[PDB]
Design a protein around this nucleic acid. Structure first.
Lengths: 48, 459, 47, 158, 48, 52
DNA sequence: CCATATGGTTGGGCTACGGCGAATACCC
DNA sequence: GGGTATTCGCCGTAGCCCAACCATATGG
């Protein structure tokens, strides 16, 4: 999560700030990654 | 609002009283700020614990001392014979070759800059004795430094023995010299009624004067001190100096001794000064049982060393739990020295059996029957002490056994260091080359050397 | 020099395989079909 | 091998299979003509130094081939055992040192199969074994024979 | 606060406890001169 | 490697070769007409070193 | 007045899943 | 004992601590 700050444009910096993720130490792995960590639930509506 | 003479934490400031919270108890405390705001509020019940109130100077100087030769001591073919007839004993032809070699350097007007690893044998002051009788052959004085007062005592003893019917005035000045006699000797070498001065740090500290500072005998200078080397340099206003520093500086100047200092060591240890059976190992108490069984089979004496802060005594009690047979003491120092000599005569009387010593300084005698030695913390040590222990164990023709105990194998530089300790049999220049390897590992400029040497000539 | 390339003979990669195999102290019977052990160095570093 | 065949005649199919496996081994050694006494090692080889290149970088540091320092450890082991046998030492130290020399061979061949990987002290990534030079992706097969870089090449966009 | 349980030795002592990087005014992080960024992590909430 | 060749032919395990190679158990190479404490000695049999 | 205890100075040295497998008990 | 899945396992996936030495403090 200690990511390189990107400044290709102000929008790049802003979107990089507003980016959220589901991985990390304590996140998940790509190995057992199914589709539940990939599809969009109906509760994402207006939420993500 | 008051200052304090506080005993156990330095400067104190009484700043009133503090009724503070023990968890349920309002004990009273004192507002005390100390050195760097030591904000202690001690319980007031402890009232009696409180009362109300760089080197480039010497570099260019010794560079000029290189650039200025000085006086020669011509060979004086009666003075060195006068002492030389008095030695009723053989000298090593290696050491004799080095003797007349450095005597020839005395005949040079240049500053005599010699090191010799003449350690143990047929009188190792003997080269210094005949060089000194050349030096006082022109009446010049012989400074003689030392690591310790006991070696100073022993060497001034041998000088007296050499100069019973020879008027070469030797005199000891250190901690144990009586004070009236201390300034008597100070005045006498200041008057030239003393020719040889003897002693440790006090000689560098006591204000000395030289009628003719011809000789300056330094010896095993690594433990004497590198700042003590600089104090020697302060006492070295362009004079001619002797160095029996067989155990040298750890290459902060020893590689610089290559090139300018004359590396004139002797080799070929006596075949009969045979090695001790070295056993580098981990620790196991049964091997200890076997070794002390061998030593009681020969009835000999045992060396085991302890250098850790941990209780020498409860360690000894553990040993006696293992080994109730022998009689072990504790020669941790910070003791009255009556206990020290009483332990010495107890291992002379020998009912005491295992010398639990704790320093090679505390192992500063080679008891003959001590034909084993047990070391567990040699990783946390230095090599001069190591083969001084090796040179302090075992009388000749008694095949002693060295046991070295290191379960941790996790200190790779010190690991190969102990490897290059235990490979060496005896004094066949492994003194020299082992020190070479060690200080290669220890520290690890000719450009600025000869550069500023030139401008020193310009001075 | 302006010519075609020469043609490489026994592979030097395969040579270093033989070398490490003998470093594991094993025999390799590298041969022709008629059992000649063709020392690929032809006596460069073999006694 | 006759009594292994007798076990093959014995109805115990499990011991039939075990004796069958050992029979495969001994039959392979028989037709191979190898001497099974050669599985005990005495004549340790020497790697040529181009194959173990300790070449130096600019800043003093090297291409530190881990087997070279392993070789140094083995030399110290061998000479320690040599001088220990050269003095008539007590046997426990002799046994311990022989055991340690065996560990030295074991870690040199492949570190960390028996016990932990002894790394360089002051480090925790291991000492890359000769098997590691052989086995693995960076090992000889996959690395040095299947994928490489190339000279006389180019790259641009289309 | 050194507060000895049996003595009541009361020694208040401030200690320096590290140099904590400060999120900048826009919200970034200059680290070793270089600029970092942190993408916020989602994961499943605790509970039953 | 599984199986071990010594454990294949001389019929033992990695613990047993651990004991004999790294000096924890004796294995008998000549029975010498001895006895393994009542049961006799037989070649290829492990034995502790003090009991040896 | 001396001694023994204090302390000061360097010196020198070091520290959670998947495939196969392997006991794992189990049917006649 | 010969044979059966089985069931879960394993493998794979940067700190003092004393050693001399010195002066500093003190009761018979």
């Amino acid at each position: 999560l200690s990511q390189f700050k990107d400044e290709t444009n102000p929008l790049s910096s802003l979107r990089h700030k507003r980016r959220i993720s589901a991985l990390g130490p304590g996140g998940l792995t790509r190995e057992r990654a199914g589709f539940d960590v990939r599809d969009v639930h109906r509760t994402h509506y207006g939420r993500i | 609002g008051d200052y304090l003479i506080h005993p156990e934490h330095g400067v104190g400031q009484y700043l009133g009283l503090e009724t503070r919270e023990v968890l349920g108890v309002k004990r009273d405390y004192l507002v005390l700020r100390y050195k760097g705001e030591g904000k202690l509020y001690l319980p007031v019940e402890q009232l009696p614990l409180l009362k109300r109130h760089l080197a480039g100077r010497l570099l260019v100087l010794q560079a000029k001392r290189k650039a200025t030769p000085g006086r020669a001591f011509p060979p004086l073919p009666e003075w060195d014979p006068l002492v030389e007839k008095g030695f009723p004993y053989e000298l090593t032809p290696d050491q004799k070759r080095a003797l007349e070699e450095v005597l020839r350097d005395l005949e040079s007007p240049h500053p005599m800059d010699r090191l010799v690893s003449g350690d143990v044998g047929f009188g190792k002051t003997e080269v210094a004795l005949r060089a000194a009788h050349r030096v006082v052959g022109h009446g010049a004085q012989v400074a003689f430094l030392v690591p310790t007062t006991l070696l100073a005592e022993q060497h001034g003893k041998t000088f007296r023995e050499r100069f019973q019917g020879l008027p070469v005035r030797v005199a000891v000045l250190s901690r144990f010299t009586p004070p009236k006699e201390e300034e008597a000797i100070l005045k006498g070498l200041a008057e030239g009624t003393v020719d040889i001065v003897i002693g440790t740090h006090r000689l560098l500290q006591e204000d000395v004067r030289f009628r003719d500072l011809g000789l300056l005998i330094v010896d095993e200078e690594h433990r004497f001190g590198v700042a003590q080397k600089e104090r020697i340099r302060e006492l070295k206003a362009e004079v001619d100096t002797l160095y029996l520093s067989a155990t040298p500086i750890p290459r902060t100047l020893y590689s610089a001794l290559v090139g300018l200092k004359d590396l004139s060591s002797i080799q070929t240890p006596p075949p009969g000064r045979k090695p001790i059976k070295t056993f580098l190992a981990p620790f196991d108490p049964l091997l200890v049982r076997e070794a002390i069984l061998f030593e009681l089979e020969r009835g000999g004496k045992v060396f085991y060393v302890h250098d850790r802060v941990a209780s020498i005594e409860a360690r000894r009690r553990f040993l006696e739990s293992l080994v109730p047979e022998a009689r072990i003491g504790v020669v941790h120092g910070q003791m009255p020295e009556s206990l020290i000599e009483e332990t010495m005569l107890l291992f002379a009387e020998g009912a005491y059996d295992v010398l639990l010593a704790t320093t090679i300084i505390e192992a500063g005698l080679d008891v003959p029957e001590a034909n084993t030695i047990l070391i567990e913390r040699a990783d946390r040590l230095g090599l001069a002490t190591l083969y001084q222990l090796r040179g302090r164990v075992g009388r000749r023709e008694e095949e002693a056994y060295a046991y070295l105990f290191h379960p941790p194998r996790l200190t790779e530089a010190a690991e190969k260091r102990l490897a290059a300790i235990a490979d060496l049999s005896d004094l066949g220049s492994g003194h020299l080359l082992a020190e070479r390897d060690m200080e290669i590992r220890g520290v690890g400029s000719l450009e600025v050397y000869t550069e500023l040497l030139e401008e020193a000539i310009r001075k | 020099k302006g010519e075609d390339v020469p043609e490489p003979s026994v592979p030097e990669s395969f040579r270093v395989l033989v070398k490490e195999l003998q470093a594991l102290a094993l025999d390799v019977q590298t041969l022709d079909e008629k059992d000649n052990p063709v020392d690929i160095f032809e006596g460069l570093a073999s006694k | 091998e006759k009594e292994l065949l007798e076990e093959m005649k014995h109805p115990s199919r499990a011991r039939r299979a075990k004796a069958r496996k050992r029979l495969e081994v001994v039959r392979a050694f028989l037709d191979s003509g190898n001497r099974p006494e050669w599985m005990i090692l005495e004549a340790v080889p020497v790697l040529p130094p181009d194959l173990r290149p300790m070449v130096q970088v600019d800043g003093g540091r090297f291409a530190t081939s881990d087997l070279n320092d392993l070789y140094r450890r083995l030399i110290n082991r061998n000479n320690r055992l040599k001088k220990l046998l050269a003095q008539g030492a007590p046997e426990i130290i002799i046994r311990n040192e022989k055991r340690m020399l065996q560990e030295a061979v074991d870690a040199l061949l492949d570190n960390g199969r028996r016990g932990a990987p002894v790394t360089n002290p002051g480090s925790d990534r291991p000492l890359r074994s000769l098997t590691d030079i052989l086995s693995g992706k960076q090992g000889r097969f996959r690395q040095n024979l299947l994928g490489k870089r190339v000279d006389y090449s180019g790259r641009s966009v289309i | 606060q050194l507060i000895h349980k049996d003595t009541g030795l009361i020694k208040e002592d401030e200690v320096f406890l590290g140099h904590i990087p400060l999120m900048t005014e826009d919200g970034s992080f200059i680290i070793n001169g270089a600029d970092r960024v942190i993408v916020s992590q989602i994961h499943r909430s605790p509970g039953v | 490697d599984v199986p071990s060749k010594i454990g294949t032919l001389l019929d033992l395990s990695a613990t047993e070769l651990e004991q004999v190679l790294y000096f924890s158990k004796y294995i008998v190479l000549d029975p010498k007409g001895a006895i393994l404490n009542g049961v006799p000695v037989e070649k290829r049999q492990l034995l502790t070193d003090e009991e040896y």
